[PDB]
Design a protein around this ligand. Sequence first.
Ligand SMILES: [Zn+2]
Length: 192
Amino acid sequence: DLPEIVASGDPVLHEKAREVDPGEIGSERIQKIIDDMIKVMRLAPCVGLAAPQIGVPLRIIVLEDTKEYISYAPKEEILAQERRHFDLMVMVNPVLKERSNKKALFFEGCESVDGFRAAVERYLEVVVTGYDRQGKRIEVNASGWQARILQHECDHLDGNLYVDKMVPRTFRTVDNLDLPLAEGCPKLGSHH
Ligand SMILES: [Zn+2]
């Protein structure tokens, strides 16, 4: 049976998830939680999911962005966001760190806050150390939209959602997505 995505207000999404014991990573148990994430992500569809969003209070994230999803976005926005496809990534106990003080500002949404968007400022360059799905120690250097999803998913594990880190006056229904920003809202884009 496939778990449901958990909505905002459920305390599992607002409290800090706990680390997987690295000796446990390859058990049928953590493997099932992982496979469940992957399936819930591909069903939605979305580019990223964290374990708290399926009710599991653990430090686990998955992410994928496919050529197919990407060929839906305006070709010029794909270019501003630096949005490039990348194979399915699983990380257990991810620890995120920026590689520089450069930030970008664009719209994100979250499966836990259904129907809405807001502009959120992200580090453009990250590193995430952690474990892959076989208990092996990995590091991942990420920029552009990939680094965005890493930060979004990582945020979940500390009980942080984007509605609590969005630029004022940008929150909006999906349908209002393309409406103009109000005066004194910063422009979407990035640093030189
Ligand atoms: Zn989310």
